[PDB]
Design a protein around this ligand. Sequence first.
Ligand SMILES: [Mg+2]
Ligand SMILES: [Mg+2]
Ligand SMILES: [Mg+2]
Ligand SMILES: [Mg+2]
Ligand SMILES: [Mg+2]
Lengths: 273, 274, 275, 274, 283
Amino acid sequence: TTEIELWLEPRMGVNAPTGDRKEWYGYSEVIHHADGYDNNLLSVQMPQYSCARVQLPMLNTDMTCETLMMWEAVSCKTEVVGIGSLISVHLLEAKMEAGPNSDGPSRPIEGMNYHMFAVGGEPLDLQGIESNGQTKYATAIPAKSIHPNDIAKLPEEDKAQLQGLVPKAKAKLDKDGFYPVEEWSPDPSRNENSRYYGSFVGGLQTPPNLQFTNAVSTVLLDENGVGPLCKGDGLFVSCADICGVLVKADNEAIRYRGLPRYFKVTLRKRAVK
Amino acid sequence: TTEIELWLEPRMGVNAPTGDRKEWYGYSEVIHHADGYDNNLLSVQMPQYSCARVQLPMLNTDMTCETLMMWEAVSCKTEVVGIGSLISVHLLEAKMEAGPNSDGPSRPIEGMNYHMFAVGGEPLDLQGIESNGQTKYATAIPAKSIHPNDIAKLPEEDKAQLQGLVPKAKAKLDKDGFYPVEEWSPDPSRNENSRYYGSFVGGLQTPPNLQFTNAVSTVLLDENGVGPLCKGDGLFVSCADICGVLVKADNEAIRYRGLPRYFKVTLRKRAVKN
Amino acid sequence: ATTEIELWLEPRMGVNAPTGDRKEWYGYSEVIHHADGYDNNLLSVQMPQYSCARVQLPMLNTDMTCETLMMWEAVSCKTEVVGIGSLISVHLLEAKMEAGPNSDGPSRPIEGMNYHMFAVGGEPLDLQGIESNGQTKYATAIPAKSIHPNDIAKLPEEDKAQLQGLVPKAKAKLDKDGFYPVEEWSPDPSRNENSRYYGSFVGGLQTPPNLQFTNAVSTVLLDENGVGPLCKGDGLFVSCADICGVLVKADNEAIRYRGLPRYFKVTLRKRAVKN
Amino acid sequence: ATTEIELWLEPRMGVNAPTGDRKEWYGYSEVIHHADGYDNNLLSVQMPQYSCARVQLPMLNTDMTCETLMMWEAVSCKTEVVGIGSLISVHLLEAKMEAGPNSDGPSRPIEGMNYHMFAVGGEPLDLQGIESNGQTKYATAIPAKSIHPNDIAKLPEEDKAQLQGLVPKAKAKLDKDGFYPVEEWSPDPSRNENSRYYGSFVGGLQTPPNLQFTNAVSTVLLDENGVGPLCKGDGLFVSCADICGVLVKADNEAIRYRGLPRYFKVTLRKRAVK
Amino acid sequence: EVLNIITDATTEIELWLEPRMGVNAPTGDRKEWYGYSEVIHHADGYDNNLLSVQMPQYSCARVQLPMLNTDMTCETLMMWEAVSCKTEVVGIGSLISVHLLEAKMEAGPNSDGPSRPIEGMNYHMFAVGGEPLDLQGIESNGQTKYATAIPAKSIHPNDIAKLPEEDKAQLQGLVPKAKAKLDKDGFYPVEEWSPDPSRNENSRYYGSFVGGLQTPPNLQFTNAVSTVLLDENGVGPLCKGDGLFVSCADICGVLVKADNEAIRYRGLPRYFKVTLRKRAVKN
Ligand SMILES: [Mg+2]
Ligand SMILES: [Mg+2]
Ligand SMILES: [Mg+2]
Ligand SMILES: [Mg+2]
Ligand SMILES: [Mg+2]
């Protein structure tokens, strides 16, 4: 038996409280309707998956032996923190929800809620897609994010295929704040050594629906009673928690809002062949 | 136990990234309110079911034996991929969700959500229906789609019957991207060797509600512990996943949007009476 | 010992046949306005009704005088609303456009009130009558095209406000297809001891319709003592009503209800009873 | 050994009888305006109330002084709201039309607040008082048409803001039908040991009413020790309240609450007690 | 070290927790709005200082249980173990009111219709533990201006983390130093403090949130359900010092002012009934 705790901070676009965008950590950069067509869509405008690898106590001195020991993740407790902050109606720079001569409340955080968490023994497998195959993305050296066609490398005239399923558009979630949610999803064709759980509610004004409790556990064992086996004695957790949007007052454009997620994974030892 | 994996790409109307409509693959053609009355409704304006038959390993050397082996589908995992892409508020040509002089976001994908998947040992049985019996449909040779009255062959003065249940309007889901969702539904009076599961949320602005996970399975065994029996060593898989609509900015017409679905079907060998 | 029974029930939303002047709106209701029943007489074609049918089962007993008889017992059923995919249409005929007045957008889809109920019993489903407005004016026909609670209760005109509560005399059996309007009749929970009914309702004019369809789900009809509905006279009685929303006309924004057909598959067994 | 009990509870939305001047709006409330209770005295007919009734059961004991006595024990119940189909009406008398000003569209259907609760017990249901506005003005008549929390707590006027929280003195028994308003009284969870109540609430003015009806479902009334409500005095007490939405008037856009009758079927058995 | 249960070994506890939406007492100038928050405007906290009365807070209370051990230096002692509890929000029916004082009218400009009912954000949580509930701090806006009084009427996450002004944007993520214990009624704002899942090993909390300004409130109430407080090992919270700690917060929606369309939060009281048993422990 053993237990592992850690926090995953949100990666909505502004992924660090530094630089010019310092004051909007935990948010995305402002997004307009023609972005990606009038201009190049920035990394800071695309909410990304969070990820982390935890080094577990190394179990095998000689890895050449036929019978080895491995950490097996049996269950997990996970929770999104800071949900109470979403009741705010005094949001900075946010649009007022009232008539022209009023002094009413600001728009609260509302809209798209995308929530996923994953526990596995190796990086999460991702499948790429594009809502618009010809969306213009900015490029920097080094790269601040990675998009499906950076791997599939289809000709520019063939990028409409990315609106369906491109088998070459696959990747591993091997870097935090690097894979945009709107382009990558957990790959159901793989992820045999991982468990992921996701839900999505669209719309711009949809009421956010979130729960939080410390009395619920997610069992990670499969039908055979075997959970994720941590290769290299590494535990891989990943998440994504878009909780809604903020509506700017001046031009009504939006930023996504994310919240931190907590993990407590319970592991046992298993002998493998 | 053997597992079979495959993807079913969406057939919303623009069913291939080729031609003039190449850039809107995975979407439908633009739809206006008077389409089908002011003109002929196009096949690219009607989302259709996706289907595929998978050839399984041949099991029998002689089909006249009283006892034969058949592949039995016992369970399945299925998932709609690309759900995170539905958060986009920078959609091409989409209507802006803000005031007249603003520079706000675009409408995200929202509206009708029609999600169904099916696993069987033979093509899925379909039942035809029309919301408007007198809807005008375009015709090409060869046909790009098939409609209920193409089989029922009712006189034009009797097509209002298709707004109810016309028993002669039956078909098998035997062609990918051919049977429109708005005209064909899984036939509950048949499909004894298939299992289908469907859900529908209407409206044009409804927030889409979707889930994705790899820790959930659907048991395909019936009350007698028998799953679909693959006739001719063929596993038949069907789906249709309308995830909402995109609203044009210039004239506010809509395109349906669909997403690919994945299948992992678990099968075993069963001996049956012949 | 065992038998299965299949049948369809076509919707009875008002226009109950693809014949006559209203032929093209079979499966819909007649157009309804806010003052109908007040400035004019409300028509039966404007009132969705329950669908019902009696299925003749194989005869079980020869001498009906015998002390011990045999009855068919419905144990389970599968039921499904077919044609749900047609509700995605945004090109509905004569429908209001869902966009700015100077656009060329889609039509309003079928949305709004969803009233879904099905029933299986050994006798006609017992109904209880009610009125949302006691003084609603209903058209009169001989023979009648529909029946209303006061046709049975027969209260004086000045006492019809009682029908907005519960009038015990306002009771009937669902004994005629396309005859008992939904807005006036409900399953009677004070009876129906030999029937099983399951119903749900979601109101509003713009509510998104929420419907499911599958063939891997059954409904067990046995009660807490393991007894299902016993078919009297060797007759199986099925009932249903499936309002899936409304259509909004473009010219004056009035509405029509819309329904879809429902399928039944009931499994029955033989059961001995005392006469 | 075992008995069954049936009874109907008619709604007490304000107009609590099909007699008098407000005869035609039985089953509804009186019209409610925003400034009512401030511009005037709020009427009892403007406040939906709980229904209740005591059902006399067969007498069991010839001497209430014996150490061992028999009592009726309610083990399970079947309850249903009737008339749900009537909520589809879009031709409500005097109701606001939901269409453009030049149109001839349908009326507003019944929608908005849904407050549904039923209770079964061996004695009157215990209630706890509250006020959303402590200084609400209530009309007075002799005999009283309803009762309010401060009629029992008897706080001075300048301290009535306490009733916007928890005032322990504002307690009462549901001992009179069409007498205790819903907006002032809730079931008291600090008591009601000999009762079972089940309630739900969806607010707002335009929320779609969501209701179900079936005769295949029962509610078990036993507690964790397998004991149900014991009927003191051989009397069974049932209570309810079923606000199903509001009607909006066309002329001033004010509202009436609308309720529906509720049916009860309670199964009882004989139990010996000390 | 938890041992076995001792089989007068049980007891029951009841109490009410009144809402602390900001106006936390029916006294003073804000007396008439007890159970509500103070009026809130969009630019509050930016062009002025946000007040304690404008920030709904958690309710909490300690219940003194019967003393179990006379000699606290004994090797084997006994503690109260909370096994289950019933909890209920009272006054839910009051939320049907459409004649709310000073509330905006929901009708056309020349009409006389109903007021807006209570609707909007719903935040409902309750917690039962053997010690104060652990809290984790956060800020929706890092630079929100908060009014300060001596003594303080509420506490904010940066009062503990003590970050410099140019680093308060970290409070929009997870600042580990911003932790506290729910040890004071009407003092910890809901919009800044959440139950800390990295701690609270001796507490059980259950919460849900539905946002938006016009969302229909959805609440239930019944006396026929219990919440089992035992963990996976069959051990409920152990009450250190024979003290039972109950916490809650029940924002049920907002009231919209008619004159300027600004809002007040509204809360309702919550009831608790905790069942406890005697559990042996090793000191
Ligand atoms: Mg695989
Ligand atoms: Mg069949
Ligand atoms: Mg009866
Ligand atoms: Mg008590
Ligand atoms: Mg810990």
